[PDB]
PDB file of C-alpha atoms in Angstrom:
ATOM      1  CA  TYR Y 502     -17.934  -9.398  10.593  1.00 15.22           C
ATOM      2  CA  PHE Y 503     -16.403  -8.072   7.241  1.00 12.47           C
ATOM      3  CA  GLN Y 504     -19.893  -7.331   5.883  1.00 13.46           C
ATOM      4  CA  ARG Y 505     -20.905  -4.447   5.767  1.00 13.45           C
ATOM      5  CA  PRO Y 506     -17.238  -3.741   5.137  1.00 13.62           C
ATOM      6  CA  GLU Y 507     -17.569  -0.171   5.278  1.00 11.86           C
ATOM      7  CA  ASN Y 508     -15.596  -0.291   8.910  1.00 15.89           C
ATOM      8  CA  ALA Y 509     -12.170  -0.295   8.656  1.00 15.91           C
ATOM      9  CA  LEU Y 510     -11.621   2.246   5.780  1.00 15.34           C
ATOM     10  CA  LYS Y 511     -13.741   4.659   8.672  1.00 15.80           C
ATOM     11  CA  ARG Y 512     -11.329   3.728  11.093  1.00 14.41           C
ATOM     12  CA  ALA Y 513      -8.288   3.858   8.695  1.00 14.02           C
ATOM     13  CA  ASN Y 514      -9.714   7.764   8.395  1.00 12.84           C
ATOM     14  CA  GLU Y 515     -10.210   8.154  11.846  1.00 18.72           C
ATOM     15  CA  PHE Y 516      -6.859   6.536  12.553  1.00 18.27           C
ATOM     16  CA  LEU Y 517      -5.874   9.368  10.268  1.00 16.71           C
ATOM     17  CA  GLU Y 518      -7.528  12.139  12.003  1.00 16.07           C
ATOM     18  CA  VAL Y 519      -5.559  11.626  14.862  1.00 17.25           C
ATOM     19  CA  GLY Y 520      -2.298  11.449  12.998  1.00 15.26           C
ATOM     20  CA  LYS Y 521      -2.046   7.842  13.806  1.00 14.92           C
ATOM     21  CA  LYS Y 522      -0.966   7.356  10.005  1.00 13.48           C
ATOM     22  CA  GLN Y 523       1.100   4.391  10.939  1.00 10.57           C
ATOM     23  CA  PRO Y 524      -0.966   2.900  12.673  1.00  8.74           C
ATOM     24  CA  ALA Y 525      -4.023   3.360   9.995  1.00  7.41           C
ATOM     25  CA  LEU Y 526      -1.663   1.803   7.185  1.00  9.29           C
ATOM     26  CA  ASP Y 527      -0.885  -1.069   9.915  1.00  9.85           C
ATOM     27  CA  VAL Y 528      -4.517  -2.010  10.359  1.00  7.69           C
ATOM     28  CA  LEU Y 529      -5.312  -1.754   7.153  1.00  7.96           C
ATOM     29  CA  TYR Y 530      -2.667  -4.619   6.079  1.00  7.21           C
ATOM     30  CA  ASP Y 531      -4.361  -6.704   8.863  1.00  7.12           C
ATOM     31  CA  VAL Y 532      -7.711  -6.816   6.711  1.00  8.53           C
ATOM     32  CA  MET Y 533      -6.795  -7.173   3.887  1.00 10.23           C
ATOM     33  CA  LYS Y 534      -4.471 -10.210   4.313  1.00  9.61           C
ATOM     34  CA  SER Y 535      -6.590 -11.868   7.275  1.00 14.66           C
ATOM     35  CA  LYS Y 536      -7.712 -15.335   5.938  1.00 13.34           C
ATOM     36  CA  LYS Y 537     -11.058 -14.971   5.997  1.00 14.49           C
ATOM     37  CA  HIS Y 538      -9.945 -13.535   2.908  1.00 13.90           C
ATOM     38  CA  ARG Y 539     -10.192 -16.179   0.229  1.00 16.35           C
ATOM     39  CA  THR Y 540     -14.016 -16.754   1.116  1.00 19.24           C
ATOM     40  CA  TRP Y 541     -14.920 -13.293   1.125  1.00 18.65           C
ATOM     41  CA  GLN Y 542     -15.596 -11.004  -2.296  1.00 16.34           C
ATOM     42  CA  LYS Y 543     -13.285  -9.247  -4.490  1.00 16.78           C
ATOM     43  CA  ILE Y 544     -14.936  -6.100  -3.521  1.00 17.25           C
ATOM     44  CA  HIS Y 545     -12.490  -6.284  -0.714  1.00 15.92           C
ATOM     45  CA  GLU Y 546      -9.579  -6.145  -2.657  1.00 18.43           C
ATOM     46  CA  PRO Y 547     -10.855  -2.582  -3.640  1.00 19.40           C
ATOM     47  CA  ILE Y 548     -10.421  -1.994  -0.072  1.00 21.66           C
ATOM     48  CA  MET Y 549      -6.860  -3.637  -0.239  1.00 18.86           C
ATOM     49  CA  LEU Y 550      -6.282  -1.039  -3.223  1.00 18.82           C
ATOM     50  CA  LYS Y 551      -7.314   1.356  -1.159  1.00 19.67           C
ATOM     51  CA  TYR Y 552      -4.757   0.182   2.167  1.00 18.44           C
ATOM     52  CA  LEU Y 553      -1.460   0.178  -0.637  1.00 19.18           C
ATOM     53  CA  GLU Y 554      -2.484   3.938  -1.595  1.00 20.16           C
ATOM     54  CA  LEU Y 555      -1.882   4.719   1.942  1.00 19.85           C
ATOM     55  CA  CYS Y 556       1.514   2.914   2.121  1.00 17.14           C
ATOM     56  CA  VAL Y 557       2.315   4.958  -0.962  1.00 20.33           C
ATOM     57  CA  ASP Y 558       2.375   7.809   0.453  1.00 21.98           C
ATOM     58  CA  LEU Y 559       4.549   6.598   3.999  1.00 25.54           C
ATOM     59  CA  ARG Y 560       6.437   5.166   1.316  1.00 23.52           C
ATOM     60  CA  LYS Y 561       6.056   2.143   3.205  1.00 24.28           C
ATOM     61  CA  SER Y 562       7.047  -0.573   0.481  1.00 24.56           C
ATOM     62  CA  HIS Y 563       8.369  -3.464   2.258  1.00 26.19           C
ATOM     63  CA  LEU Y 564       5.083  -3.437   3.292  1.00 25.35           C
ATOM     64  CA  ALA Y 565       3.555  -2.757   1.172  1.00 22.52           C
ATOM     65  CA  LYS Y 566       4.997  -5.836  -1.339  1.00 24.80           C
ATOM     66  CA  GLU Y 567       3.965  -8.667   1.286  1.00 26.90           C
ATOM     67  CA  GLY Y 568       0.246  -6.760   1.455  1.00 25.30           C
ATOM     68  CA  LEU Y 569      -0.250  -7.396  -2.323  1.00 24.56           C
ATOM     69  CA  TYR Y 570       1.590 -10.764  -2.261  1.00 20.26           C
ATOM     70  CA  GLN Y 571       0.225 -12.477   0.698  1.00 20.70           C
ATOM     71  CA  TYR Y 572      -3.110 -10.986  -0.442  1.00 25.06           C
ATOM     72  CA  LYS Y 573      -2.894 -12.055  -3.749  1.00 26.87           C
ATOM     73  CA  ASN Y 574      -1.587 -15.568  -2.294  1.00 24.35           C
ATOM     74  CA  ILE Y 575      -5.173 -15.969  -0.053  1.00 27.48           C
ATOM     75  CA  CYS Y 576      -7.603 -14.457  -3.148  1.00 26.90           C
ATOM     76  CA  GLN Y 577      -6.884 -16.474  -5.771  1.00 27.71           C
ATOM     77  CA  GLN Y 578     -10.021 -18.422  -5.546  1.00 30.19           C
ATOM     78  CA  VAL Y 579     -12.447 -15.229  -6.601  1.00 27.65           C
ATOM     79  CA  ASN Y 580     -12.367 -12.110  -7.774  1.00 24.68           C
ATOM     80  CA  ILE Y 581      -8.672 -13.483  -9.545  1.00 23.54           C
ATOM     81  CA  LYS Y 582      -8.396 -10.129 -11.759  1.00 21.75           C
ATOM     82  CA  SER Y 583      -8.663  -8.160  -8.236  1.00 18.78           C
ATOM     83  CA  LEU Y 584      -4.716  -8.901  -8.770  1.00 19.19           C
ATOM     84  CA  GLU Y 585      -4.078  -6.983 -11.486  1.00 22.65           C
ATOM     85  CA  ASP Y 586      -6.368  -4.566 -10.893  1.00 22.78           C
ATOM     86  CA  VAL Y 587      -4.563  -4.046  -7.472  1.00 20.34           C
ATOM     87  CA  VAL Y 588      -1.700  -3.918  -9.291  1.00 22.49           C
ATOM     88  CA  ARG Y 589      -2.562  -1.751 -10.992  1.00 21.54           C
ATOM     89  CA  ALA Y 590      -3.507   0.727  -8.687  1.00 17.98           C
ATOM     90  CA  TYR Y 591      -0.146   0.570  -6.940  1.00 20.38           C
ATOM     91  CA  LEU Y 592       1.309   1.325 -10.424  1.00 24.17           C
ATOM     92  CA  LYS Y 593      -0.788   4.558 -10.431  1.00 23.50           C
ATOM     93  CA  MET Y 594      -0.294   5.682  -7.474  1.00 23.02           C
ATOM     94  CA  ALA Y 595       3.353   5.892  -7.720  1.00 25.33           C
ATOM     95  CA  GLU Y 596       3.351   7.142 -10.608  1.00 23.20           C
ATOM     96  CA  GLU Y 597       1.505  10.280  -9.308  1.00 25.10           C
ATOM     97  CA  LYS Y 598       3.076  10.563  -6.595  1.00 25.96           C
ATOM     98  CA  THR Y 599       6.781  10.976  -9.625  1.00 25.59           C
ATOM     99  CA  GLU Y 600       4.678  13.257 -11.423  1.00 25.52           C
ATOM    100  CA  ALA Y 601       3.865  15.452  -7.877  1.00 28.62           C
ATOM    101  CA  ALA Y 602       7.620  15.477  -6.406  1.00 28.01           C
ATOM    102  CA  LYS Y 603       8.717  16.255  -9.614  1.00 28.20           C
ATOM    103  CA  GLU Y 604       6.456  18.664 -11.060  1.00 26.58           C
ATOM    104  CA  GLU Y 605       6.834  20.987  -7.359  1.00 26.77           C
ATOM    105  CA  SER Y 606      10.813  20.413  -7.519  1.00 26.37           C
ATOM    106  CA  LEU Y 607      13.522  13.259  -4.518  1.00 25.47           C
ATOM    107  CA  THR Y 608      15.859  10.407  -5.776  1.00 25.09           C
ATOM    108  CA  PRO Y 609      14.089   8.320  -2.983  1.00 28.09           C
ATOM    109  CA  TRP Y 610      10.471   9.265  -4.334  1.00 28.76           C
ATOM    110  CA  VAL Y 611      12.842   8.012  -8.000  1.00 30.37           C
ATOM    111  CA  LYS Y 612      14.462   4.805  -6.300  1.00 30.51           C
ATOM    112  CA  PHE Y 613      10.938   3.807  -4.534  1.00 30.21           C
ATOM    113  CA  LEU Y 614       8.775   3.812  -7.653  1.00 29.80           C
ATOM    114  CA  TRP Y 615      12.295   1.626  -9.008  1.00 30.43           C
ATOM    115  CA  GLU Y 616      11.202  -0.063  -6.376  1.00 30.58           C
ATOM    116  CA  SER Y 617       7.659  -0.283  -7.024  1.00 28.44           C
ATOM    117  CA  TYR Y 618       7.804  -0.675 -10.532  1.00 29.02           C
ATOM    118  CA  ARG Y 619      10.092  -4.229  -9.787  1.00 28.62           C
ATOM    119  CA  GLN Y 620       7.647  -5.946  -7.122  1.00 29.05           C
ATOM    120  CA  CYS Y 621       5.217  -5.412  -9.511  1.00 31.98           C
ATOM    121  CA  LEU Y 622       6.648  -7.218 -12.271  1.00 32.49           C
ATOM    122  CA  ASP Y 623       7.581  -9.861 -10.029  1.00 34.35           C
ATOM    123  CA  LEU Y 624       4.250 -10.240  -8.369  1.00 34.85           C
ATOM    124  CA  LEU Y 625       2.521 -10.639 -12.109  1.00 34.85           C
ATOM    125  CA  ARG Y 626       4.966 -12.313 -13.372  1.00 33.19           C
ATOM    126  CA  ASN Y 627       4.243 -15.713 -14.962  1.00 38.06           C
ATOM    127  CA  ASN Y 628       0.961 -16.010 -14.451  1.00 35.52           C
ATOM    128  CA  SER Y 629      -1.648 -16.886 -18.005  1.00 33.79           C
ATOM    129  CA  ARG Y 630      -4.233 -14.018 -15.943  1.00 35.99           C
ATOM    130  CA  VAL Y 631      -1.998 -10.990 -15.763  1.00 34.60           C
ATOM    131  CA  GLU Y 632      -0.289 -11.144 -18.656  1.00 33.87           C
ATOM    132  CA  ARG Y 633      -1.772  -8.508 -20.375  1.00 36.69           C
ATOM    133  CA  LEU Y 634      -1.013  -6.611 -16.870  1.00 34.49           C
ATOM    134  CA  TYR Y 635       2.192  -7.471 -16.798  1.00 36.14           C
ATOM    135  CA  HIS Y 636       2.636  -6.897 -20.230  1.00 36.99           C
ATOM    136  CA  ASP Y 637       1.333  -2.857 -19.832  1.00 37.93           C
ATOM    137  CA  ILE Y 638       3.510  -2.308 -16.811  1.00 37.10           C
TER     138      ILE Y 638
END
């Protein structure tokens, strides 16, 4: 039922429309950390990136780290760069939340950001294919 894969994201939006944001986030986590994922195309990594992004709004850092790591362990097989791309995505998302909170004003948000940088660095650490992305972060 993965393909067409326009359903997980839709249902996430639906779950948020009813205001059950956390249920929506946890739902996407289930999708991207599913065992069928390795067989699945790198494209889902797009979906995983979106899920990681919602995670940012809810400041659910723990779930985010676990989402990314667990997704990475599954995906090594194919669409490997995808890991670097969702890493980049995560960083750009938290990096924009800093812009928002700073421009509107907050400590937690700085700490959230630090914790995010740290997690991405420990995720990308020591990987030939992730070296450029790691160096960037």
